[PDB]
């Protein structure tokens, strides 16, 4: 239907360029842990 | 049995199975809720 | 001993750039199978 | 006939990126010389 198929592949490439470069600068992705919300949820529960 | 030298790429898992993952590794594994799908991502760090 | 330590890291990067780009052009690495040598070895054995 | 014409140009670019990067890592292309086959051909001839 859409000729855009190769423009989907052209998105993937820079993502790899982005991801690889991000690891060099030590920018941390997937840092979300159990810290704030549940404590607030505990406070909101009380 | 082998020890992972560097962090493995994240994989999608259910909340029940992913919490289980944490029960073995827990310093060595990392799990998060995905807000939209309610499921969890499982990422094994180095030392697993 | 050698200050070259960061020049070792600077080799690794383009290797990733090389490897990623090589997969796009479908240039196949690790193609060596059992084809020629053992047949020749079989012939050389006879 | 095919609109893909610019996707042919987009292949050429990374090839240059590939080739240039490959020379930096000293990965040698076009290394095939007269070594194995003709010796085997000589053996297969005998």
PDB file of C-alpha atoms in Angstrom:
ATOM      1  CA  UNK A   1       0.000   0.000   0.000  1.00  0.00           C
ATOM      2  CA  UNK A   2       2.609   2.530   1.114  1.00  0.00           C
ATOM      3  CA  UNK A   3       5.927   2.905  -0.732  1.00  0.00           C
ATOM      4  CA  UNK A   4       7.429   4.094   2.573  1.00  0.00           C
ATOM      5  CA  UNK A   5       8.883   0.643   3.344  1.00  0.00           C
ATOM      6  CA  UNK A   6      12.521   1.656   2.843  1.00  0.00           C
ATOM      7  CA  UNK A   7      11.944   4.797   4.908  1.00  0.00           C
ATOM      8  CA  UNK A   8      11.242   2.456   7.813  1.00  0.00           C
ATOM      9  CA  UNK A   9      14.666   0.888   7.313  1.00  0.00           C
ATOM     10  CA  UNK A  10      16.228   4.346   7.134  1.00  0.00           C
ATOM     11  CA  UNK A  11      14.875   5.023  10.629  1.00  0.00           C
ATOM     12  CA  UNK A  12      16.479   1.885  12.071  1.00  0.00           C
ATOM     13  CA  UNK A  13      20.001   2.837  10.988  1.00  0.00           C
ATOM     14  CA  UNK A  14      20.409   6.144  12.880  1.00  0.00           C
ATOM     15  CA  UNK A  15      18.767   4.430  15.862  1.00  0.00           C
ATOM     16  CA  UNK A  16      21.780   2.128  15.861  1.00  0.00           C
ATOM     17  CA  UNK A  17      23.971   5.174  15.317  1.00  0.00           C
ATOM     18  CA  UNK A  18      22.100   6.842  18.180  1.00  0.00           C
ATOM     19  CA  UNK A  19      22.288   3.849  20.520  1.00  0.00           C
ATOM     20  CA  UNK A  20      25.979   3.185  19.866  1.00  0.00           C
ATOM     21  CA  UNK A  21      26.904   6.847  20.318  1.00  0.00           C
ATOM     22  CA  UNK A  22      24.806   7.097  23.484  1.00  0.00           C
ATOM     23  CA  UNK A  23      26.786   4.296  25.128  1.00  0.00           C
ATOM     24  CA  UNK A  24      30.026   6.180  24.461  1.00  0.00           C
ATOM     25  CA  UNK A  25      28.848   9.264  26.352  1.00  0.00           C
ATOM     26  CA  UNK A  26      27.633   6.950  29.129  1.00  0.00           C
ATOM     27  CA  UNK A  27      24.093   8.291  28.853  1.00  0.00           C
ATOM     28  CA  UNK A  28      22.051   5.739  30.750  1.00  0.00           C
ATOM     29  CA  UNK A  29      18.819   4.419  29.262  1.00  0.00           C
ATOM     30  CA  UNK A  30      16.421   2.205  31.164  1.00  0.00           C
ATOM     31  CA  UNK A  31      17.204   3.784  34.532  1.00  0.00           C
ATOM     32  CA  UNK A  32      13.695   3.629  36.025  1.00  0.00           C
ATOM     33  CA  UNK A  33      13.570   1.695  39.306  1.00  0.00           C
ATOM     34  CA  UNK A  34      11.338   1.507  42.355  1.00  0.00           C
ATOM     35  CA  UNK A  35      12.032   4.789  44.139  1.00  0.00           C
ATOM     36  CA  UNK A  36       9.406   7.536  44.046  1.00  0.00           C
ATOM     37  CA  UNK A  37       5.930   6.395  42.940  1.00  0.00           C
ATOM     38  CA  UNK A  38       5.430   3.449  45.340  1.00  0.00           C
ATOM     39  CA  UNK A  39       6.616   5.551  48.286  1.00  0.00           C
ATOM     40  CA  UNK A  40       4.095   8.164  47.191  1.00  0.00           C
ATOM     41  CA  UNK A  41       1.603   5.339  46.676  1.00  0.00           C
ATOM     42  CA  UNK A  42       2.363   4.212  50.224  1.00  0.00           C
ATOM     43  CA  UNK A  43       1.884   7.792  51.412  1.00  0.00           C
ATOM     44  CA  UNK A  44      -1.277   8.135  49.322  1.00  0.00           C
ATOM     45  CA  UNK A  45      -2.485   4.861  50.828  1.00  0.00           C
ATOM     46  CA  UNK A  46      -2.085   6.100  54.398  1.00  0.00           C
TER      47      UNK A  46
ATOM     48  CA  UNK B   1      26.653 -22.337  32.989  1.00  0.00           C
ATOM     49  CA  UNK B   2      28.280 -19.112  31.795  1.00  0.00           C
ATOM     50  CA  UNK B   3      28.704 -15.624  33.252  1.00  0.00           C
ATOM     51  CA  UNK B   4      27.569 -12.760  31.032  1.00  0.00           C
ATOM     52  CA  UNK B   5      30.484 -10.392  30.440  1.00  0.00           C
ATOM     53  CA  UNK B   6      28.401  -7.416  29.281  1.00  0.00           C
ATOM     54  CA  UNK B   7      24.736  -6.400  29.618  1.00  0.00           C
ATOM     55  CA  UNK B   8      22.284  -8.347  27.450  1.00  0.00           C
ATOM     56  CA  UNK B   9      19.676  -6.634  25.266  1.00  0.00           C
ATOM     57  CA  UNK B  10      16.280  -6.126  26.932  1.00  0.00           C
ATOM     58  CA  UNK B  11      13.486  -8.633  26.299  1.00  0.00           C
ATOM     59  CA  UNK B  12       9.730  -8.355  26.883  1.00  0.00           C
ATOM     60  CA  UNK B  13       8.198 -10.455  29.665  1.00  0.00           C
ATOM     61  CA  UNK B  14       5.076 -10.658  31.832  1.00  0.00           C
ATOM     62  CA  UNK B  15       4.981  -9.026  35.274  1.00  0.00           C
ATOM     63  CA  UNK B  16       4.761 -12.396  37.032  1.00  0.00           C
ATOM     64  CA  UNK B  17       7.707 -13.856  35.121  1.00  0.00           C
ATOM     65  CA  UNK B  18       9.794 -10.683  35.344  1.00  0.00           C
ATOM     66  CA  UNK B  19       9.406 -10.333  39.113  1.00  0.00           C
ATOM     67  CA  UNK B  20      10.660 -13.912  39.263  1.00  0.00           C
ATOM     68  CA  UNK B  21      13.726 -12.863  37.254  1.00  0.00           C
ATOM     69  CA  UNK B  22      14.514 -10.346  39.981  1.00  0.00           C
ATOM     70  CA  UNK B  23      14.397 -13.059  42.651  1.00  0.00           C
ATOM     71  CA  UNK B  24      17.582 -14.744  41.368  1.00  0.00           C
ATOM     72  CA  UNK B  25      19.914 -12.038  40.074  1.00  0.00           C
ATOM     73  CA  UNK B  26      18.514  -9.051  41.786  1.00  0.00           C
ATOM     74  CA  UNK B  27      21.723  -7.024  41.897  1.00  0.00           C
ATOM     75  CA  UNK B  28      22.486  -8.432  38.447  1.00  0.00           C
ATOM     76  CA  UNK B  29      19.085  -8.133  36.714  1.00  0.00           C
ATOM     77  CA  UNK B  30      16.829  -5.179  35.973  1.00  0.00           C
ATOM     78  CA  UNK B  31      13.052  -5.143  35.382  1.00  0.00           C
ATOM     79  CA  UNK B  32      10.576  -2.345  34.570  1.00  0.00           C
ATOM     80  CA  UNK B  33       6.865  -1.898  33.959  1.00  0.00           C
ATOM     81  CA  UNK B  34       6.057  -0.747  30.433  1.00  0.00           C
ATOM     82  CA  UNK B  35       3.355   1.884  31.143  1.00  0.00           C
ATOM     83  CA  UNK B  36       1.357   1.249  27.963  1.00  0.00           C
ATOM     84  CA  UNK B  37       1.358  -2.558  27.775  1.00  0.00           C
ATOM     85  CA  UNK B  38       1.609  -3.164  31.549  1.00  0.00           C
ATOM     86  CA  UNK B  39       4.222  -5.859  30.844  1.00  0.00           C
ATOM     87  CA  UNK B  40       7.859  -5.823  31.946  1.00  0.00           C
ATOM     88  CA  UNK B  41      11.267  -5.530  30.273  1.00  0.00           C
ATOM     89  CA  UNK B  42      13.977  -7.899  31.501  1.00  0.00           C
ATOM     90  CA  UNK B  43      17.584  -6.725  31.201  1.00  0.00           C
ATOM     91  CA  UNK B  44      20.454  -8.899  32.418  1.00  0.00           C
ATOM     92  CA  UNK B  45      23.519  -6.933  33.493  1.00  0.00           C
ATOM     93  CA  UNK B  46      27.130  -8.085  33.630  1.00  0.00           C
ATOM     94  CA  UNK B  47      27.757 -10.828  36.177  1.00  0.00           C
ATOM     95  CA  UNK B  48      24.525 -12.733  35.564  1.00  0.00           C
TER      96      UNK B  48
ATOM     97  CA  UNK C   1      53.244   2.070  29.985  1.00  0.00           C
ATOM     98  CA  UNK C   2      51.716   3.212  26.697  1.00  0.00           C
ATOM     99  CA  UNK C   3      49.400   6.238  26.526  1.00  0.00           C
ATOM    100  CA  UNK C   4      47.766   4.599  23.493  1.00  0.00           C
ATOM    101  CA  UNK C   5      44.886   3.207  25.587  1.00  0.00           C
ATOM    102  CA  UNK C   6      42.223   5.508  24.126  1.00  0.00           C
ATOM    103  CA  UNK C   7      43.515   4.800  20.620  1.00  0.00           C
ATOM    104  CA  UNK C   8      42.469   1.203  21.232  1.00  0.00           C
ATOM    105  CA  UNK C   9      38.937   2.405  21.948  1.00  0.00           C
ATOM    106  CA  UNK C  10      39.026   4.549  18.813  1.00  0.00           C
ATOM    107  CA  UNK C  11      39.641   1.376  16.792  1.00  0.00           C
ATOM    108  CA  UNK C  12      36.597  -0.387  18.249  1.00  0.00           C
ATOM    109  CA  UNK C  13      34.155   2.325  17.167  1.00  0.00           C
ATOM    110  CA  UNK C  14      34.694   2.229  13.375  1.00  0.00           C
ATOM    111  CA  UNK C  15      34.709  -1.573  13.655  1.00  0.00           C
ATOM    112  CA  UNK C  16      31.117  -1.237  14.822  1.00  0.00           C
ATOM    113  CA  UNK C  17      30.571   1.301  12.059  1.00  0.00           C
ATOM    114  CA  UNK C  18      32.205  -1.170   9.673  1.00  0.00           C
ATOM    115  CA  UNK C  19      30.245  -4.193  10.894  1.00  0.00           C
ATOM    116  CA  UNK C  20      26.887  -2.401  10.880  1.00  0.00           C
ATOM    117  CA  UNK C  21      27.464  -0.960   7.408  1.00  0.00           C
ATOM    118  CA  UNK C  22      28.643  -4.332   6.088  1.00  0.00           C
ATOM    119  CA  UNK C  23      25.355  -5.970   7.074  1.00  0.00           C
ATOM    120  CA  UNK C  24      23.440  -3.356   5.078  1.00  0.00           C
ATOM    121  CA  UNK C  25      25.281  -4.188   1.855  1.00  0.00           C
ATOM    122  CA  UNK C  26      24.726  -7.881   2.632  1.00  0.00           C
ATOM    123  CA  UNK C  27      28.457  -8.578   2.528  1.00  0.00           C
ATOM    124  CA  UNK C  28      28.745 -11.977   4.154  1.00  0.00           C
ATOM    125  CA  UNK C  29      31.409 -12.593   6.788  1.00  0.00           C
ATOM    126  CA  UNK C  30      32.148 -16.011   8.219  1.00  0.00           C
ATOM    127  CA  UNK C  31      31.290 -17.846   5.002  1.00  0.00           C
ATOM    128  CA  UNK C  32      33.948 -20.574   5.217  1.00  0.00           C
ATOM    129  CA  UNK C  33      32.469 -24.085   5.159  1.00  0.00           C
ATOM    130  CA  UNK C  34      33.615 -27.585   4.294  1.00  0.00           C
ATOM    131  CA  UNK C  35      33.917 -27.487   0.508  1.00  0.00           C
ATOM    132  CA  UNK C  36      37.376 -27.410  -1.071  1.00  0.00           C
ATOM    133  CA  UNK C  37      40.233 -28.370   1.280  1.00  0.00           C
ATOM    134  CA  UNK C  38      38.884 -31.707   2.598  1.00  0.00           C
ATOM    135  CA  UNK C  39      37.986 -32.824  -0.931  1.00  0.00           C
ATOM    136  CA  UNK C  40      41.540 -31.932  -1.911  1.00  0.00           C
ATOM    137  CA  UNK C  41      42.697 -33.634   1.287  1.00  0.00           C
ATOM    138  CA  UNK C  42      40.707 -36.688   0.212  1.00  0.00           C
ATOM    139  CA  UNK C  43      42.306 -36.460  -3.229  1.00  0.00           C
ATOM    140  CA  UNK C  44      45.735 -35.900  -1.675  1.00  0.00           C
ATOM    141  CA  UNK C  45      45.089 -38.919   0.545  1.00  0.00           C
ATOM    142  CA  UNK C  46      44.379 -41.211  -2.401  1.00  0.00           C
TER     143      UNK C  46
ATOM    144  CA  UNK D   1       9.765   1.888 -14.280  1.00  0.00           C
ATOM    145  CA  UNK D   2      10.988   1.565 -10.695  1.00  0.00           C
ATOM    146  CA  UNK D   3      11.051   4.568  -8.345  1.00  0.00           C
ATOM    147  CA  UNK D   4      13.939   2.854  -6.523  1.00  0.00           C
ATOM    148  CA  UNK D   5      16.560   4.941  -8.365  1.00  0.00           C
ATOM    149  CA  UNK D   6      17.598   6.993  -5.327  1.00  0.00           C
ATOM    150  CA  UNK D   7      17.750   3.828  -3.226  1.00  0.00           C
ATOM    151  CA  UNK D   8      20.550   2.725  -5.540  1.00  0.00           C
ATOM    152  CA  UNK D   9      22.451   5.898  -4.672  1.00  0.00           C
ATOM    153  CA  UNK D  10      21.792   5.287  -0.979  1.00  0.00           C
ATOM    154  CA  UNK D  11      23.600   1.952  -1.317  1.00  0.00           C
ATOM    155  CA  UNK D  12      26.700   3.562  -2.828  1.00  0.00           C
ATOM    156  CA  UNK D  13      27.250   5.934   0.097  1.00  0.00           C
ATOM    157  CA  UNK D  14      27.692   3.399   2.936  1.00  0.00           C
ATOM    158  CA  UNK D  15      29.852   1.367   0.540  1.00  0.00           C
ATOM    159  CA  UNK D  16      32.213   4.335   0.570  1.00  0.00           C
ATOM    160  CA  UNK D  17      31.735   4.538   4.327  1.00  0.00           C
ATOM    161  CA  UNK D  18      32.420   0.798   4.462  1.00  0.00           C
ATOM    162  CA  UNK D  19      35.465   0.910   2.185  1.00  0.00           C
ATOM    163  CA  UNK D  20      37.039   3.903   3.934  1.00  0.00           C
ATOM    164  CA  UNK D  21      36.482   2.410   7.388  1.00  0.00           C
ATOM    165  CA  UNK D  22      37.820  -0.970   6.260  1.00  0.00           C
ATOM    166  CA  UNK D  23      41.141   0.582   5.243  1.00  0.00           C
ATOM    167  CA  UNK D  24      41.525   2.069   8.725  1.00  0.00           C
ATOM    168  CA  UNK D  25      41.262  -1.328  10.416  1.00  0.00           C
ATOM    169  CA  UNK D  26      43.698  -2.680   7.811  1.00  0.00           C
ATOM    170  CA  UNK D  27      41.217  -5.329   6.702  1.00  0.00           C
ATOM    171  CA  UNK D  28      42.643  -6.525   3.413  1.00  0.00           C
ATOM    172  CA  UNK D  29      40.364  -6.941   0.404  1.00  0.00           C
ATOM    173  CA  UNK D  30      41.488  -8.520  -2.838  1.00  0.00           C
ATOM    174  CA  UNK D  31      43.920 -10.904  -1.150  1.00  0.00           C
ATOM    175  CA  UNK D  32      43.402 -13.911  -3.442  1.00  0.00           C
ATOM    176  CA  UNK D  33      46.630 -15.091  -5.084  1.00  0.00           C
ATOM    177  CA  UNK D  34      47.976 -18.267  -6.639  1.00  0.00           C
ATOM    178  CA  UNK D  35      48.488 -20.547  -3.643  1.00  0.00           C
ATOM    179  CA  UNK D  36      46.079 -23.435  -3.082  1.00  0.00           C
ATOM    180  CA  UNK D  37      43.911 -24.324  -6.103  1.00  0.00           C
ATOM    181  CA  UNK D  38      46.644 -24.695  -8.765  1.00  0.00           C
ATOM    182  CA  UNK D  39      48.752 -26.822  -6.411  1.00  0.00           C
ATOM    183  CA  UNK D  40      45.660 -28.955  -5.881  1.00  0.00           C
ATOM    184  CA  UNK D  41      45.076 -28.790  -9.635  1.00  0.00           C
ATOM    185  CA  UNK D  42      48.653 -29.987 -10.100  1.00  0.00           C
ATOM    186  CA  UNK D  43      48.002 -32.759  -7.581  1.00  0.00           C
ATOM    187  CA  UNK D  44      44.666 -33.564  -9.224  1.00  0.00           C
ATOM    188  CA  UNK D  45      46.470 -33.653 -12.569  1.00  0.00           C
ATOM    189  CA  UNK D  46      48.997 -36.232 -11.388  1.00  0.00           C
TER     190      UNK D  46
END
